[PDB]
Amino acid sequence: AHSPPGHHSVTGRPSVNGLALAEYVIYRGEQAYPEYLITYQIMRPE
Amino acid sequence: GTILIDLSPDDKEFQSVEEEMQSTVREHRDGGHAGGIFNRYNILKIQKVCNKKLWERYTHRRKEVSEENHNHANERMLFHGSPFVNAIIHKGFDERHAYIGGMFGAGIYFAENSSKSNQYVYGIGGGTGCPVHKDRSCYICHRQLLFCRVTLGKSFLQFSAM
Ligand SMILES: COc1ccc(C2(CNC(=O)c3ccc(NC(=O)c4ccco4)cc3Cl)CCOCC2)cc1
Ligand SMILES: [Zn+2]
């Protein structure tokens, strides 16, 4: 895909769940730099 | 082209990245179906990704965007989760591989909630979970996310029904 004309990205902003933060979409790979690689496990709650 | 520099846990940079990862976990409406059930992570390793070509390509585009948007790149630090993380760190993001239509169309997706990106590490909707146990909520297998520098420029505001 391509950005909407006159835009460089899309912001997907949840409007129903008021605690959910945004997502974002870009359409050129040069518009991001993968700065940190994070290796992790999810933790089982107590 | 790419080297990975391991950060020590006593490094302020390790600590600030860990805090962004931990503090942006939320509950998900699938009850943990896709990404598993958790409130926090065990961070095992944080590596700085160093690639001079990819960085110069990034800063070149960032300046073009900034000049198109009243000198404002609108740069953010955002999470990316997918099964393509190991290809991304060597080759850079490539929109030619990002042809899968999600909610905001084809493109390269990032999230403010680390737990949102965690839903995609094993594929769409968590895929079949980890390779070893086929468990979307695996507490054993190691996962990887990218914490990325992203130029948004002028961003189309799409309100979503989520
Ligand atoms: C198969 O698992 C998937 C996980 C998430 C997605 C969505 C987000 N995808 C992207 O953000 C995305 C980003 C980057 C790349 N690839 C590269 O940049 C790349 C470079 C070199 C090799 O690959 C591929 C994809 Cl699919 C999540 C929601 O649905 C829409 C697609 C699609 C499939
Ligand atoms: Zn596993």
From Swiss-Prot, chain A:
Transmembrane segments: none
Function according to Swiss-Prot or TrEMBL: Poly-ADP-ribosyltransferase involved in various processes such as Wnt signaling pathway, telomere length and vesicle trafficking. Acts as an activator of the Wnt signaling pathway by mediating poly-ADP-ribosylation of AXIN1 and AXIN2, 2 key components of the beta-catenin destruction complex: poly-ADP-ribosylated target proteins are recognized by RNF146, which mediates their ubiquitination and subsequent degradation. Also mediates poly-ADP-ribosylation of BLZF1 and CASC3, followed by recruitment of RNF146 and subsequent ubiquitination.
Protein name (Swiss-Prot/TrEMBL): Poly [ADP-ribose] polymerase tankyrase-2
Protein family membership: Belongs to the ARTD/PARP family.
Signal peptide from the UniProt entry: none
Tissue distribution: Highly expressed in placenta, skeletal muscle, liver, brain, kidney, heart, thymus, spinal cord, lung, peripheral blood leukocytes, pancreas, lymph nodes, spleen, prostate, testis, ovary, small intestine, colon, mammary gland, breast and breast carcinoma, and in common-type meningioma. Highly expressed in fetal liver, heart and brain.
PTM: Ubiquitinated at 'Lys-48' and 'Lys-63' by RNF146 when auto-poly-ADP-ribosylated; this leads to degradation. Deubiquitinated by USP25; leading to stabilization.
Protein location: Cytoplasm; Golgi apparatus membrane; Nucleus; Chromosome, Telomere
Self-association and partners: Oligomerizes and associates with TNKS. Interacts with the cytoplasmic domain of LNPEP/Otase in SLC2A4/GLUT4-vesicles. Binds to the N-terminus of Grb14 and TRF1 with its ankyrin repeat region. Interacts with HIF1AN. Interacts with RNF146; this interaction leads to ubiquitination and proteasomal degradation. Interacts with NUMA1.
Residues of the full protein shown: 1116 to 1161 of 1166
Annotated organism of origin: Homo sapiens
